[PDB]
Amino acid sequence: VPDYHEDIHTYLREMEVKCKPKVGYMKKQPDITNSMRAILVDWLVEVGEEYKLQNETLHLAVNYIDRFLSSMSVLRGKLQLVGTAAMLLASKFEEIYPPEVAEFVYITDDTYTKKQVLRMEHLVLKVLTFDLAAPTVNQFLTQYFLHQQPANCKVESLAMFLGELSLIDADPYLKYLPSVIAGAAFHLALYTVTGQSWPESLIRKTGYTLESLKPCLMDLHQTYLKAPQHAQQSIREKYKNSKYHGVSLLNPPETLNL
Amino acid sequence: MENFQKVEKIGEGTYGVVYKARNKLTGEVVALKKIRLDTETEGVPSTAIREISLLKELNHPNIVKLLDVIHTENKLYLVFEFLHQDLKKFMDASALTGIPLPLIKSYLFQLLQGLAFCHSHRVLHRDLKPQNLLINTEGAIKLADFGLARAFGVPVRTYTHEVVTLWYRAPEILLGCKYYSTAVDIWSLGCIFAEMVTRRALFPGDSEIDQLFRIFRTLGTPDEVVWPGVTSMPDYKPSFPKWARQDFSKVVPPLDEDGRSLLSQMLHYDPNKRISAKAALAHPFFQDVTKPVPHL
Ligand SMILES: NS(=O)(=O)c1ccc(Nc2cc(OC3CCCCC3)nc3ncnn23)cc1
């Protein structure tokens, strides 16, 4: 338990409310859909795998994208360009060795120029007014992980897996705060692997009961149950490897009894 | 951008150049940082993404305030509250007389308050030194230049190694530890506390191994007893000379019992024993703390 962990947790809980996108932004986007956003996020999972990027970077890019699309109408042919710039900005924020701009140009298979990517980067910065230090599901998850008795790596890996699936589907997950999704994901992974439940220490820390996590739990369980039939599969493939202990191969429990 | 009249250059830090300027219209005096973007290459530098985003949420009396970001397409400009002097120039201007102990106390208290705020908002500054600490005429001191800062996680992860100015750089970095956190910032303040007391830099090496030796020669060569793990650290060598710990009453003679207590806790070899900024605020060294105004 590190020196400032309770303070940071409290501050993150303050910032996650200030860093949220508009819930129903997609409904006023005349050209793009939730379905195209799923394609984009799924591709970005692929990109992160290819360049060995932190999962935190993935999470930041999606936050940037959702905040950006909340205030800018974007045409389908330019959606990928927003995401690439988002990824580039997340990498520069989070990574020790961000990939170069030429590498982000190269993975769009030359759909965009280097010029376009740098201009979008500048435009994203303006729209986000340089506020890039967003709280992510990932940040709350790693904090929750410290209240585990003891560390179960399959729980940890499975919770990351569930928290990542939530990035793909804007409806419904845009309704839930990151701290809430993380809780839902922590509980669902715990239950699945060991049978245990959202522990008392987390109820104390977050103020979250199983009752407050219910609505998000109900959604995440559906998402988990249907994951093998989803149009987008990069995350399931990601979490099939041994580095993640093959947790996406595990069976979701049929009921949660909540 | 046209409202600003540049007066002079006042610094050049981790990146870009900083000017003293005046708002032609309001008369406010500010510090203007210029970052060139020269389009063709790599975009906005990560050093600036980090500094701006972090400073946007580091609003505290002991941190320099970011007032505005003026973002042209050719350049990027940061507007800061103006501070007239850094601690280095102040320490030179009182080489002979020394800084009065109340002023040392208060500056340290204030620096700890500003650093606690950072750590508690999950930011590591990673470049604390006398020329990055800015003073005004009213008795305040503030942390500046967040160019080398980052947002850390719980728990931490491997971060960049090429970090902190040589003289102020904690041993876990010099010796190559997988991991470092908030403790590296405290080591730097320990160094700075000492420098304020004696007039001279504490460990002024000119290479990594020279820096190590200088630390060793003062604090004693570290071993398993004092720092469980040293001898198994990546850049630790068995052939390091074994110097004995010098006595604090010779390292830092003007300090009383409370100050040596505090200084030794900021300078523990083991990062897990190194005092926190928040815990340091509670130290008896600070019970009689005031807000002295320099003869400035
Ligand atoms: N050289 S000095 O007279 O002691 C001096 C030092 C600093 C300043 N002011 C200053 C200098 C400065 O420089 C940057 C880059 C160099 C390291 C410190 C931060 N950034 C700033 N933000 C607000 N005031 N301010 C003015 C004079």
Side-chain angles (χ1 to χ4, degrees), chain A residues 11 92 94 114 121-122, chain B residues 41 44 57 71 150 157:
Chain A
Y11 175 65
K92 281 162 166 190
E94 198 53 25
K114 170 172 190 142
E121 155 173 276
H122 188 292
Chain B
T41 59
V44 182
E57 47 182 54
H71 190 179
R150 85 165 290 149
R157 213 168 68 214

Side-chain angles (χ1 to χ4, degrees), chain B residues 237-267:
Chain B
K237 283 165 118 121
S239 63
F240 282 169
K242 299 163 171 7
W243 285 285
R245 191 175 174 86
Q246 238 148 275
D247 211 291
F248 263 31
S249 42
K250 304 270 196 65
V251 176
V252 79
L255 238 10
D256 59 27
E257 115 209 339
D258 280 344
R260 301 180 325 245
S261 163
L262 185 46
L263 180 77
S264 66
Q265 290 175 251
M266 292 171 87
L267 301 167

